[PDB]
Each structure stands twice: as structure tokens, then as C-alpha cells.
Amino acid sequence: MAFRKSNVYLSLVNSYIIDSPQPSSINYWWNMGSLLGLCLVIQIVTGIFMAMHYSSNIELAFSSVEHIMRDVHNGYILRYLHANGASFFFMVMFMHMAKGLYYGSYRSPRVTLWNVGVIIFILTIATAFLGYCCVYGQMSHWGATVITNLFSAIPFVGNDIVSWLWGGFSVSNPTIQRFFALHYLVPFIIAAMVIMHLMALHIHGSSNPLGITGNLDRIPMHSYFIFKDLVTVFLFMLILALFVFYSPNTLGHPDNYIPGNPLVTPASIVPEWYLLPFYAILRSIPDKLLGVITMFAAILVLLVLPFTDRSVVRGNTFKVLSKFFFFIFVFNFVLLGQIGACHVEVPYVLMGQIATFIYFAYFLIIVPVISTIENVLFYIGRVNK
Amino acid sequence: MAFRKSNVYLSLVNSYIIDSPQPSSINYWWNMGSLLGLCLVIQIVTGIFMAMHYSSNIELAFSSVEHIMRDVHNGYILRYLHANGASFFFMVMFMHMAKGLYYGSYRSPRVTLWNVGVIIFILTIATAFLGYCCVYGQMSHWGATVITNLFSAIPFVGNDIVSWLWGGFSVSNPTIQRFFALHYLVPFIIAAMVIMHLMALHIHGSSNPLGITGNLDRIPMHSYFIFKDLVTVFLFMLILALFVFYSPNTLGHPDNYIPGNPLVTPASIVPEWYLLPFYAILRSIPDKLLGVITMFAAILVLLVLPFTDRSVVRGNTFKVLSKFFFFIFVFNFVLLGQIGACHVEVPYVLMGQIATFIYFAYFLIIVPVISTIENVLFYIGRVNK
Amino acid sequence: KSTYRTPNFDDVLKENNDADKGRSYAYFMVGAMGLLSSAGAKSTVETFISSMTATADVLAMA
Amino acid sequence: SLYKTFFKRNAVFVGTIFAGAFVFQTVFDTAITSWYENHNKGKLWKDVKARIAA
Amino acid sequence: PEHDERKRLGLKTVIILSSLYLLSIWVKKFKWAGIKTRKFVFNPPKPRK
Amino acid sequence: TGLHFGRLSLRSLTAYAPNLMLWGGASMLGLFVFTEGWPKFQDTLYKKIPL
Amino acid sequence: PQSFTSIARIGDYILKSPVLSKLCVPVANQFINLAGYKKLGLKFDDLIAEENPIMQTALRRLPEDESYARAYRIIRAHQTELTHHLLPRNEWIKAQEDVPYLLPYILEAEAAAKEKDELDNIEVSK
Amino acid sequence: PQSFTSIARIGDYILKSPVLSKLCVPVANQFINLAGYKKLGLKFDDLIAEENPIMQTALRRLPEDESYARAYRIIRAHQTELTHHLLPRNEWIKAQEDVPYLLPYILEAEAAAKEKDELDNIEVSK
Numbered sequence A, B: 001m002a003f004r005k006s007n008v009y010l011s012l013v014n015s016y017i018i019d020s021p022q023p024s025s026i027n028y029w030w031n032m033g034s035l036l037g038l039c040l041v042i043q044i045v046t047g048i049f050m051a052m053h054y055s056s057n058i059e060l061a062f063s064s065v066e067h068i069m070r071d072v073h074n075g076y077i078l079r080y081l082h083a084n085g086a087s088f089f090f091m092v093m094f095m096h097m098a099k100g101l102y103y104g105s106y107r108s109p110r111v112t113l114w115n116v117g118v119i120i121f122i123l124t125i126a127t128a129f130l131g132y133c134c135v136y137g138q139m140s141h142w143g144a145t146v147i148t149n150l151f152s153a154i155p156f157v158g159n160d161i162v163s164w165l166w167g168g169f170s171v172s173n174p175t176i177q178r179f180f181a182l183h184y185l186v187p188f189i190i191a192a193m194v195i196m197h198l199m200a201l202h203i204h205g206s207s208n209p210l211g212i213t214g215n216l217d218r219i220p221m222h223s224y225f226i227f228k229d230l231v232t233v234f235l236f237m238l239i240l241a242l243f244v245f246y247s248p249n250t251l252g253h254p255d256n257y258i259p260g261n262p263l264v265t266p267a268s269i270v271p272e273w274y275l276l277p278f279y280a281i282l283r284s285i286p287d288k289l290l291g292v293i294t295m296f297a298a299i300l301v302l303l304v305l306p307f308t309d310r311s312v313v314r315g316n317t318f319k320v321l322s323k324f325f326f327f328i329f330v331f332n333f334v335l336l337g338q339i340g341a342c343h344v345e346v347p348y349v350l351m352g353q354i355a356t357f358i359y360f361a362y363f364l365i366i367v368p369v370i371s372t373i374e375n376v377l378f379y380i381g382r383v384n385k
Numbered sequence C: 001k002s003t004y005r006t007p008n009f010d011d012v013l014k015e016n017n018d019a020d021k022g023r024s025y026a027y028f029m030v031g032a033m034g035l036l037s038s039a040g041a042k043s044t045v046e047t048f049i050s051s052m053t054a055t056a057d058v059l060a061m062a
Numbered sequence D: 001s002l003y004k005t006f007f008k009r010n011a012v013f014v015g016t017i018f019a020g021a022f023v024f025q026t027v028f029d030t031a032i033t034s035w036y037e038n039h040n041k042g043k044l045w046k047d048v049k050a051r052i053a054a
Numbered sequence E: 001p002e003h004d005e006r007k008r009l010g011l012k013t014v015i016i017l018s019s020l021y022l023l024s025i026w027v028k029k030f031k032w033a034g035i036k037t038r039k040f041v042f043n044p045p046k047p048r049k
Numbered sequence F: 001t002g003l004h005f006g007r008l009s010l011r012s013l014t015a016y017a018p019n020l021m022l023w024g025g026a027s028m029l030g031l032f033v034f035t036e037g038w039p040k041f042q043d044t045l046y047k048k049i050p051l
Numbered sequence G, H: 001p002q003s004f005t006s007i008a009r010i011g012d013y014i015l016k017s018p019v020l021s022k023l024c025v026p027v028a029n030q031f032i033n034l035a036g037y038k039k040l041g042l043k044f045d046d047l048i049a050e051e052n053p054i055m056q057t058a059l060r061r062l063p064e065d066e067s068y069a070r071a072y073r074i075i076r077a078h079q080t081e082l083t084h085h086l087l088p089r090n091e092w093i094k095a096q097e098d099v100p101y102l103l104p105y106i107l108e109a110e111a112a113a114k115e116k117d118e119l120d121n122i123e124v125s126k
């Protein structure tokens, strides 16, 4: 055997990105998982260089971000990459998870692959919250106030959890010095969950857009899917260039260029655009205990999808009723994001109430009724009885 | 098969710490590698809790360590553990590497195991330097001055490397803000080199104090070497208790309780005790280019030991001339550490000059001459000719 | 039919199959896509190591 | 001939893609730091530091 | 204050990368020419098989 | 029969050499790529006759 | 996972009913053509997932003249997908040859699994 | 990795020399007893590392009556080490049975390896 399959470490490289048997049929949607390995390298590398010029005290926090942008050599290149790159991290991950429930890979034998992916999505939301509180702008103070006040609704436990989460009695100086130290660590826990995520893929491989088995026609990774990889990696860094150099402040709020003040309140407190559909679900339940339960049990409703699909065919390729309800779930996640950036008014409280019910009727009422009607309609359309 | 050898992740736990075939003959020196997995967990965990109350600016650095020690609840427990624990990290690692060149495990087929271990020892010295510069005491200023001034001796490159390492023209405020951000990262690179270190052990296993093969008499890991493990783990945390609660400042310098001043110089600038033998090698060469080459090519002289042993028996158990020269190398590393805490005087410059030659005559002149004399003396003592 | 009767590939085939025709134009393009990826990758590693130099308000106190 | 000139030799195919990239950055930076200037004239600092000569 | 410097380095990268992206579509569809034109034919085996 | 090799197969004496004079013209040429932007000993590069 | 036994229990009840099988059978026919699996050269029993220990049993018991012709319909469909075209209308499965060749082998591998568990959870008394 | 060809080349030259073998042979005898490998019930050829493709050849060619008695001397020594005692003086190898049983099989596996490389790096001319 060759040296690349004889060495201890090179055979790990050879079994994953050189001679891994891939199906012959996969299209450009199987590339979004490769961009996320580049997206995570960019956000870690640009952040270690920006951590050399940062001060996490509450009286120095909104001056070390400006010292980076005005005094550090090419410091505006570092920040604008680490603020438009995290919004590029999320647009790929919304398209990664949406593919995997179209082709329906969550099924057997890939259920551990789907369960370690839900843990990554929880830890990714938590870093983008903890790092947006490190700028200490005006949106960065009243966003940490509203979220940490929810943990007082836990009965007999509440006001001893918030006072441990705050280090005081409000969003003080120990609140900002502990949020930076947790912002350095959870990106290193995500990287150890991606290594466990790739292990569960090596024992079963990828699926295909047909759904059926693909052990009859396979192609190695080298010279075909590496040169199919670089088509989208050069497209990724080209639209990551048209933002960092031409419109570097479109995906952001102007109120974050005012230093945070615990005495004047803004006219609107709205999140960054990728936490907006989860914001309208919290505001739709008129109780601060049943509102914090509902928003946490909306990322954890993905785990009931392996047990709720009643069909015998994998993937929504030849399913024409299970395809009409995939595109109702997509434009409902967009209407939920729009309402989380509105005012609490009429009718944006009844619209955010109906549309947070369609988020839950999909995984529990719409999937098992339609994936059972199709099993009978594939049967009585063929069997002559 | 059982569930522990059927699961994806549990069979990784089962192949390493449950059913790994161990020799029946190993003694209590094969436990030092297990303490270092606990030593690295302690230093990471106590440091993330101390990073919530720390400010890395040069005017706030010698007041956030004191705010921890008098205001933080049990903050003196956190610091004294993270300052006596790092000196416990090194006493085990000096005894780990000394076992592996007694039994002589560096030999074939374990040479990648010895080469990834030298990389860990370089990255461990670098963290203890970068974190001792974060207190910003008086030893913490003049220790970073002396070391970073050595990189100006590189011809045509020097004064553009130090000015990039300093961020200015001396040990300024950007020097302390970049040394903390690199102190958080290199402990996470050591942990990824320990995972690669365990992989190269799983394919060949451990050695034994006899040297000969041990595939004829083996014992699993569970119930024998786990209950032999806990004898030394309870002894480790008991002497880590008699320091953190009874003599918490014996392994340290009192000059680090003065804030650092770039205008008054101390009467003696000496390192922490585990960098002392490497300090006497730098001071022994009267040139700042041939002194920085010699001290870096004294951690990298371990890589020539697989190519310099000429014997046919593995390990110094039945070798009585190769045992007398192992204990000359031990007490020479102690005399080198003593001289690195002395004054530059007579005769502590000729004593540190001879004893840094015996550090190099061992790996290159003493090993191959004595490991060849023994091969003939095991032959003509038996063969009747 | 038989396995000694290959199907027609003349709908996709070239009309003059000189060997050096496609051996030159397939090394000019892989040559050009390893030239911009060598100059467009030295400039990125250099931007990240220019930030660790002396800051603009440190050069004013020179 | 043409294929065996500089495409057969990888030591050239690693060399010339590196050697060509050294002169690529300099004929191309100068070419665009003369198009940016000529597109925007009368709005630079060197232009308005010549009508304040009085 | 970086506004004129930023838009000048904003042509060094969008000219390199938009050309580097156009080459990877030629290069990919050259090495993917054999797989897209393979033929298949089924002669069913003798009726013992 | 009893001729030149040790651990290397020395029949590649100059069957390894003149092309790594050109890989040495491709790796020291690789150091003619990353030395940019670092105007410290790039006086050893910027004396060429064009541009 | 909706058991063929249960699919055939519901499916036979619609086919026996003369008033239900004038409502569901035209909807069952437009659902087949809009699926479009025949244009890729596949019958319906090719589409079934085979990663459970009942479909692995029903594939071994299949005769070898049918086991060889099914491995070619799968490979011919992976190549029609890659070129993004469709097969010609001379290589489409018609409405007469799309029959269940795997349903007899499936329904008896299930009924033998619903006897091994009924005989291991049993409350016989004296 | 010194080679027994080279060990035996130097070793025979001392044994043939009558004035050198009154200096080195008593030093060779005190070095054996101070090694102490006989007290653990082992001959010297047990101690040799076997993780190279020459010692793996010389162990296959060994006769099976000697290959079984050597697997017991190793196991009896792993148990004497674990209990931290020594074997009794009735189970120590004496100074007559410590003979090289593996050196004939070693010296011919090396001389056949110093002909396969001499015949592959060769400069024959016409």
C-alpha cells in the first residue's frame, strides 16, 4: 500500500478527503457543509488578532473597538470581516439544515448525525449573543437586559439565577467581563463537536437526491469533488468581498454606534437579523415563564422528526404533497423574522401568534398525516385488487 | 457484541480506557501520563473562572489579580491552585520524559510517539512564559525584556522582529494585551496534540520494564489499572492541598508583589524554577546570536536519540554502564537549575560552561560509545570461540 | 448486441485529435489558476501579520 | 516544444507560478493606482494643494 | 477616515477573485467530461443465471 | 556490486539533484512570494529592471 | 415506518369498497405521474429504503434474474440525474410493468416477525 | 541497530587475539552477573527486540520444540516481576545452558539481505 494509507495521520486525511467513496449523483447542495469548515476558520482567526487590541472593562469597551477601526493597521479589514462573516456563517447553516430535511437524511441510519447537529445549532446561537454584548453599544445593553430578565420566572429559583448570571443587581461591569471570557471558549467547543459530527458520517456516507442506495456507482473525493468544491469557495469569498469593502454596515443597527447607557432607553430594541424569528416566538406568549419555555422548545422540536415521518421513501423528491408543505415552512420562517423587527401592535401580535403555531403544527400534525396518506396512495395506484 | 463496543463514541471509550490490552508487568511509573490529563484539566478550568475578573491593560493588570485575591469569593483558592498547579504540571512531565528514556521507548516502532511529545514540551514552556507576563509584577517586566531582546541578533531581520513582537519600542501596553490573548489559545493547541499523542499509542501499546515483548500475558484496563490509577490521583490532590492551604507562596518570588516599573531595576532577575536549567545555557555562551541558537537546540536535541542508540536490548534494566550515565544526566539537570538562580560570578560561569557541555555530550558522544561497548560485551561473554 | 460494437461518440468528439491541442490549453488554465492563488494568498497572510506592527498612535509617540 | 517548455517541469510549474506572481503584483498595483487617480481628479489632496499656492 | 483607502483595496480583491472564480468553472468542466458521457447497456445473462 | 548507497538508494545522486536546484528555484522562489508587504530585507527583491 | 401490513390493511379496504374507489383511485393516478419516477427508468419498489432488517431479508429471497435487472435500473437512473436530462420515451416504464415484485417477500417477512414477539411476551396459565 | 555481522566481526577479533582476551573476557563476565537476567529465568537471546523484519524472519525458522520452551520463559519472567520477588536458585539458568540458539538463524537472514541490495545497486559495464 501507498504511504498515504500506511501512515497514522495521513490515513485519517486519506479516508476523509482523498479516497472517501462518494455517490455519483450529488449536486451543489452538498457543498454547504464544506463552507462551514471555512466559515469557522475565518471567525476564529480574525478574532484572535482582534483580541490583541481589546479591553473588556465597561468603561473601555466602546473605545477599544474604535481604536481597532481608526488606529490599528488594516484594523477595519479585521472587524468588518468578523461582523459580516458571522452573518455569512448563519446563511449557510440555514441552507445546510434545510437540505437535510428535504432529502430527509435525519432518518435511519443517520439519527446520531442529526442529534449532534442540533447541539451545534444551540452553541452557535450562544456565541453570537455573547459576542454582540462585547461591543457595549446601545443595542448591546438592552439586549442583555431583556434576555437575562427571563430567568427570574423560574419559581423558587429565579432571582438567585439572574443574580449569579449578572454578578450584581443589573447588567454591570462583571457582566461584560464574564461574557468575553465565555466568548473565547464556546467556539472551541463547537470545533470539538464538528469532529464528532464527521465521525458519524464516515460510517454511513452521504445520501443522494434520489433517496435510494448508492453503493452501486461511486466516485472518489480527489479530482472530482475537490474541483467541484473550489467553484463555491471562490464564490463565497467574492460575496464576502462585496460587503467588507463596499457596504460594510448594511447588516447592522446604527444604534450600536452609541455607547450604552442604563438611563436612556431606545425607541426600538430589535435583534440581529438571524435571531429575529426566535424573537417573535418569545414575544407571542403573554407570560415570562411560558415564553422562555416555548422559545427553548423550538430548537429542540427537531429531535421529534425521526419519530414522526411515517413514509417508506426517503426524501421529498417524488412526494408532491410533502413538497408543498416544505415551502410553507420556509416562508413561515421568513414571516416570523419580519415580525420580530416590528412594533408590538395590531396586527403584529395575532400574526406572530398564528405563525408560531404553524412552526409547531408542521413537526407534529402536518408531517405524520401527510406521510401516511402518501403510503396508501403509492399502494392503491398500483395494486390491482 | 455489547453496546459499549457497538456505539460510535462508546467504542472509542472502550478501546482506550476499558478493554485496552495492557502488559501484566508495568509499575507505578506508567501512572505519570495519567496525572497529566488531570493536570491539564485543572489548569484550564481554574483559568476560565479567573478570566472573568481580569483586566489585561498595563495600568489595570496589577490590580485585577489583587481584586481576585481579596474581593472574589474563594478567589484565593482559584489563584493559588493556578500558581502551584503549574509547578505541579512540570514536576510530573519531568518524570514522564525521564521514564521514557530509561526504559528507552523512543525506539522503533515508537518514534512518532517521541516526536509529537517534543512538540508538546515546546508549547508548554511557551504558555508558562506568556502567563507569567500577565501578572505584570517586577519579575514579569524584566523577564519579558531580556527574552524579547534576544531576537535582535538575527542578522538583517532582528530589529523588525522585536518591534513586531513588542508592538512598539519596548515592553509597552500592546505587549501585555497580546500576551494574554495568546495565553488563552496555546492551552487549546496542547489538547489537540495530546489527542494525536494517544492515537500513536493505540497501535503499538505500552512497553514494559523488562523490554521484551508482552503479547503473551495481558490484562484489560478495567478493574485493575483503574484501581491502580486512583492510588496516585488521591496522592496528587493531597500534596496539591498541602501547598494551596499551608505554604501557598514557597514556589515563587517576592518581587512579583511589586508592580512593574520600567525605571528601577531589581538586584536579581531570575526565572521560575522550571526554566532555570535552560536559563544557565543561554547565559553560558558569550554572544546573543550563538546563545539563542544553543538554548533552542537543547530541547531539539532529543530528536537525535532514536538514531544514536546502538544497542540491541531495549531499556536500561540489564545495562550497568548505561545506568551509571543516566544518573549523571539527572544530577546535571539539577546543577544547571541551581546555577540559573545564581549571580554571574566566579566560578558560576565556568561551572555553567562545563555542565552545558555534558548536556550535549550525553546525546552525541556518551550514548553511541557505551551502547556499542555493551553489544560486544554481551557477545564475548557467551560465545566460545 | 455484441460488446465489440462501441456506441457513437462523434457528436462530442473533436475533428482533429492532435495530442498537444488539449495538452497545452489544459495546462495554461491550471497554470493561470495557480498563479492568482499564489499572489492572492501571500497578500492575505501578510495583512494578518501587518496588524501586529506598531499602532498609529504609538508611532506618534516616537 | 510548447508543452515540454514550462508545463512538463513541475519544478517550473511550482517555480514559474511563484516567479510570475512576484512581478504580477507590481505591474498590476501600479496599473490600478493610476486608474483610481485619473478617474478622480480635482478631488484629491495634491490637486487642491496647487490652487492654494497663493 | 479609511473611506478612500478601502475602495482602492476593494478593487485589488474583486478583480483577482472574479477572475479566479471564472477559471474554476472551466477547470472543473474539463475534468468532469469523462463521467458525464459514460454509456451503459444491459445484456441479460443466460436463463440459468 | 558493493557500491554506493546508504538508506537512500545513492543511484539517485544527481537523479534527485538538478530538479531541486529548480525546486530550490521553486521554494526559495516560494520565499520570493511571502516576503512582500514586509519591507525589511525586501531591498533584495525590489531592484529589478521593470516596475 | 408505517408497516406494510398496515398499508395493505387500509389499502384493501378502499379497493373492496365500491364507493370509496371512485374517489381515491383517480387521485392515486395523478399522484404517480406527478411523482415522475417512471421517467428516470424506475419502478416503485426500487424507491423503498433498504436500511432495516426486514428489507434486507426480502432482497436475499428475490430470484437472481430479477436481482440483476434491478441493479441496472438503479445505475441507469444515477447517470440520468448527473447529466440533468431525462431518458427518451422509449425507455420509460409503462403503466403495465409497474407491479410489486417485492411485496410478496415483504409481507411474509413481517408476519414471521409478528409471531416471534407474540411468543416471547406471553401469559400462559395452568 | 549495530548488526551481528558487525558485532561478530569485532567479537571474533577479540577472541582470536590471545592478549586481548585476557583483558576483555573477565570484564565480560562481571557484566553478565551484574545484568542479572538469569535470576528472572531468561537466556540472553530472549532479551533481543523483535520489532524489525530480520528478527521476524529468524523466529519463524526456529524449531517448534525450542519455540514452545521460549514462550514459557517469557511468561515466567512477567510474573516474577509483578510479585517483585526473584525465582529460587533451583530455577536460575546456569553458565552452561546460556548459549545462542538464535544467532545462526540471524546471521544468515542478514547475509541474504546484504546480497539483495548489492545486486540492486550495481554498475556492470560492457
Ligand SMILES: CCCCCCCCCCC(=O)OC[C@H](COP(=O)(O)OC[C@H](O)COP(=O)(O)OC[C@@H](COC(=O)CC)OC(=O)CCC)OC(=O)CCCCCCCC
Pocket: A027, A028, A029, A088, A091, A092, A231, A232, A235, A236, A239, E025, E028, E029, G084
Ligand atoms: C451567502 C451565499 C454565499 C455563496 C453560497 C452560494 C450558495 C449556493 C447554493 C445554491 C445551490 O447550490 O443550488 C444549485 C443550483 C442548481 O442546482 P444543480 O446543482 O442541480 O445545477 C448544477 C448546474 O446544472 C451545473 O453547474 P456547472 O458546474 O456546469 O457550472 C457552475 C455554474 C455555477 O456554479 C455554482 O457554484 C452554482 C452555485 O456556473 C455558471 O452557471 C456560469 C455563470 C456565469 O444553482 C442555482 O443556480 C439555483 C439558484 C437558486 C438558489 C437560491 C438559494 C439562495 C437562498
Ligand SMILES: CCCCCCCCCCC(=O)OC[C@H](COP(=O)(O)OC[C@H](O)COP(=O)(O)OC[C@@H](COC(=O)CC)OC(=O)CCC)OC(=O)CCCCCCCC
Pocket: B027, B028, B029, B088, B091, B092, B231, B232, B235, B236, B239, H084
Ligand atoms: C509533586 C509530584 C507528586 C505527584 C504524586 C507522586 C508521584 C509519585 C512518583 C513516584 C513513582 O511513581 O515511583 C513509584 C515507585 C514504586 O515502585 P514500584 O512500583 O516498583 O513498587 C510498588 C510497590 O511495591 C507496591 O505498592 P502497593 O500498591 O502495594 O502500596 C501502595 C504504595 C503507595 O502507592 C503509590 O502511589 C506509591 C507512589 O505504597 C508504597 O509503595 C509506599 C510509597 C509511599 O516508588 C519508588 O520507587 C520511590 C522512588 C522515589 C521517587 C522519587 C521522585 C522524585 C521526585
Ligand SMILES: CCCCCCCCCCCCCCCCCC(=O)OC[C@H](COP(=O)(O)OCCN)OC(=O)CCCCCCCCCCCCC
Pocket: A029, A094, A095, A097, A098, A099, A100, A102, A103, A209, A298, A299, A302, A330, A333, A334
Ligand atoms: C431550527 C430552524 C430551522 C430553520 C431552517 C429553515 C431555513 C430556511 C431558509 C431558506 C434557505 C433554504 C432554501 C432551501 C434549501 C434546501 C432546498 C433543497 O435542498 O433543494 C430543494 C430544491 C431542489 O430541487 P431540484 O434541484 O432537485 O430540481 C430538479 C428537478 N428534478 O431546490 C429548489 O428547488 C430551489 C428553490 C429555492 C428556494 C429559495 C427559498 C429561500 C428563500 C430565502 C430568503 C432569504 C431571506 C433572508
Ligand code: HEM
Pocket: A040, A043, A044, A047, A048, A050, A051, A054, A065, A079, A082, A083, A086, A089, A127, A128, A131, A132, A134, A135, A183, A184, A187, A190
Ligand atoms: C463561532 C465563532 C464566532 C462567532 C459566530 C462570533 C461572532 C461574533 C459577533 C457577531 C460579534 C459582534 C460583531 C459586531 O457586531 O461588532 C463578535 C464580537 C467579537 N468577537 Fe467574535 N465570534 C466567534 C469567534 C470568536 C473568537 C474565538 C474570538 C476570540 C477572541 C472572538 C472575538 C470577538 C471580539 C473581541 C469581539 C469584540 C467586538 C468587535 O471587535 O467587533 N470571536 N463575535
Ligand code: HEM
Pocket: A029, A030, A031, A032, A033, A034, A036, A037, A040, A093, A096, A097, A100, A103, A105, A106, A110, A113, A114, A117, A118, A120, A121, A194, A197, A201, A205, A206, A207, A208
Ligand atoms: C459548524 C457546523 C457544521 C459543519 C462543519 C457541518 C459539516 C458537515 C459536512 C461536511 C457534511 C457532509 C455532507 C455535505 O457536505 O453536505 C455534513 C452533513 C450533514 N450535516 Fe452538517 N455541518 C454543520 C452543521 C450541521 C447542523 C447545524 C445540522 C443539523 C441540525 C447538520 C446536520 C447534518 C446532516 C443530517 C448531514 C448529513 C446530510 C447527508 O449526508 O445527506 N449539520 N455536515
Ligand code: HEM
Pocket: B040, B043, B044, B047, B048, B049, B050, B051, B054, B065, B079, B082, B083, B086, B089, B127, B128, B131, B132, B134, B135, B183, B184, B187, B190
Ligand atoms: C497548559 C495550561 C496553562 C498553564 C501551564 C498556565 C500557567 C500559568 C502561570 C504559571 C501563570 C502565572 C501564575 C502566577 O504566578 O500568578 C498563569 C497566569 C494566568 N493564567 Fe494560566 N496557564 C494555563 C492555562 C490558562 C488558560 C487556558 C487561561 C485562560 C482561560 C489562563 C489564564 C490565566 C490568567 C488570567 C492568569 C492571570 C494571572 C493570575 O491570575 O495569576 N491560564 N498561567
Ligand code: HEM
Pocket: B029, B030, B031, B032, B033, B034, B036, B037, B040, B093, B096, B097, B100, B103, B105, B106, B110, B113, B114, B117, B118, B120, B121, B194, B197, B201, B205, B206, B207, B208
Ligand atoms: C500533556 C502532556 C502529556 C500527556 C497527557 C501524555 C500522555 C501519555 C499517556 C497517557 C501515556 C501512556 C501511559 C504511560 O505510558 O504512562 C503516555 C506515554 C508516553 N509518552 Fe506522554 N504524555 C504527555 C507528554 C509527553 C512528553 C512531553 C513526552 C516526551 C518528550 C511523551 C512521551 C511519551 C512516550 C514515549 C510514551 C510511551 C511510553 C511507553 O509506552 O513506554 N509524553 N503519554
Ligand SMILES: COc1c(O)c(C)c(C/C=C(/C)CC/C=C(\C)CC/C=C(\C)CC/C=C(\C)CC/C=C(\C)CCC=C(C)C)c(O)c1OC
Pocket: B016, B017, B020, B030, B033, B034, B035, B036, B037, B038, B040, B041, B044, B045, B048, B191, B194, B198, B201, B202, B205, B206, B229
Ligand atoms: C496505555 O493505556 C492507557 C492508560 O494507561 C491510561 C492511564 C489512559 C488514560 C490517561 C489519560 C491522560 C486520559 C486522556 C486525557 C484526556 C481526555 C485530556 C484531554 C481533555 C481535556 C484537556 C479537556 C479540557 C477541559 C475542558 C475543555 C472543560 C472546559 C471548562 C468548562 C466548560 C467550564 C466553564 C463553564 C462554565 C459554566 C463557567 C489511557 O487513555 C490509556 O489508553 C491509551
Ligand SMILES: COc1c(O)c(C)c(C/C=C(\C)CC/C=C(\C)CC/C=C(/C)CC/C=C(/C)CC/C=C(\C)CCC=C(C)C)c(O)c1OC
Pocket: A016, A017, A020, A033, A034, A036, A037, A038, A040, A041, A044, A045, A048, A191, A194, A198, A201, A202, A206, B189
Ligand atoms: C463529505 O466529504 C467531506 C468534505 O466535503 C469535506 C469538505 C471534508 C473536510 C472537513 C472539514 C471542512 C471540517 C472542518 C474542520 C474544522 C473547521 C476544524 C478547524 C478548527 C480550528 C479551531 C482551526 C483554527 C486553529 C487555530 C490554531 C487558529 C489559528 C490562530 C493562529 C495561527 C494564531 C496567530 C498568531 C500568531 C502569533 C501566529 C471532509 O472531511 C469530508 O469527509 C467527511
Ligand SMILES: CCCCCCCCCCCCCCC(=O)OCCCOP(=O)(O)OC[C@@H](O)COP(=O)(O)OCCCOC(C)=O
Pocket: A012, A013, A016, A017, A195, A198, A199, B012, B013, B016, B017, B195, B198, B199
Ligand atoms: C479515565 C480517563 C479519562 C477519560 C477519557 C475518555 C476516553 C479517552 C479516550 C481518548 C480518545 C482518543 C481517540 C482519538 C480520536 O478521537 O480519534 C480521532 C477521531 C476520528 O475522527 P477524525 O478523523 O479525527 O475526524 C475527521 C478528520 O480526520 C478530518 O480531517 P480533514 O479535515 O479531512 O484533514 C485535515 C485537513 C487537511 O486538508 C488539507 C490541507 O488538504
Ligand SMILES: CCCCCCCCCCCCCCC(=O)O[C@H](COC(=O)CCCCCCCCCCCC)COP(=O)(O)O
Pocket: A041, A042, A045, A077, A237, A238, A240, A241, A244, C037, C039, C040, C041, C043, C044, C045, C047, D025, D029, E009, E012, E013, E014, E016, E017, F037
Ligand atoms: C484565513 C483566510 C481568511 C480571509 C479570507 C476572507 C476572504 C474574503 C475577504 C477578502 C479579504 C482579503 C483582504 C485583502 C488583502 O488582504 O490583500 C489586499 C489585496 O490582495 C488581494 O487582492 C487578494 C485577494 C484574494 C483573496 C482570496 C483568495 C484566496 C486564496 C487562498 C487564500 C488562503 C490563505 C492587499 O493587497 P496588497 O498586496 O497590495 O497588500
Ligand SMILES: CCCCCCCCCCCCCCCCCC(=O)O[C@H](COC(=O)CCCCCC)COP(=O)(O)OCCN
Pocket: A006, A007, A008, A009, A010, A012, A013, A195, B111, B112, B115, B116, B192, B195, B196
Ligand atoms: C482528532 C483531532 C486531532 C487533530 C487532527 C488529527 C490529525 C489530522 C491530520 C493532521 C495532519 C497530519 C499530517 C502529518 C503527516 C506527517 C508524516 C508523518 O507523520 O511521518 C511520521 C513521522 O512523523 C513525526 O516524526 C512526527 C510528526 C508530527 C506531526 C505533527 C503535525 C513517520 O511515518 P511512518 O513511521 O508511519 O512511516 C513508515 C513507512 N514505512
Ligand SMILES: CCCCCCCCCCCCCCCCCC(=O)O[C@H](COC(=O)CCCCCC)COP(=O)(O)OCCN
Pocket: A111, A112, A115, A116, A119, A192, A193, A195, A196, A303, B007, B008, B009, B010, B012, B013
Ligand atoms: C470530543 C473530542 C473528540 C474525540 C473523540 C470523541 C470521544 C467521544 C466522547 C464520549 C461520548 C460518549 C457518548 C456516549 C453516549 C452516546 C449515545 C448515542 O449514541 O446517542 C445517540 C444520539 O444522541 C446523541 O447525539 C448524543 C451524542 C453524545 C455527545 C455528547 C454531547 C442516540 O440517541 P438516543 O439514545 O438519546 O435516542 C434518540 C432520542 N433522542
Ligand SMILES: Cc1cc(C)c2nc(SCc3c(C)cccc3-n3nnn(C)c3=O)sc2c1
Pocket: A125, A126, A128, A129, A130, A132, A133, A139, A140, A142, A143, A144, A146, A147, A269, A270, A271, A272, A273, A275, A278, A279, A296
Ligand atoms: C437560546 C437563545 C439564547 C440567546 C442568548 C438568545 N438571544 C436572543 S436576542 C438578543 C437581542 C435582543 C433581545 C435585542 C437586541 C439585540 C439582541 N442581540 N444580542 N445578541 N445579538 C446577536 C442580538 O441580536 S434570542 C436567544 C435564544
Ligand SMILES: Cc1cc(C)c2nc(SCc3c(C)cccc3-n3nnn(C)c3=O)sc2c1
Pocket: B125, B126, B128, B129, B130, B132, B133, B139, B140, B142, B143, B144, B146, B147, B269, B270, B271, B272, B273, B275, B278, B279, B296
Ligand atoms: C524556548 C523558550 C521560550 C521562552 C519563552 C523562555 N523563557 C525563559 S525565562 C523568562 C524569565 C526570565 C529570563 C527572568 C525572570 C522571569 C522569567 N520568566 N518568565 N516567565 N516565567 C515563567 C519566568 O520565569 S527561557 C525560555 C525558552
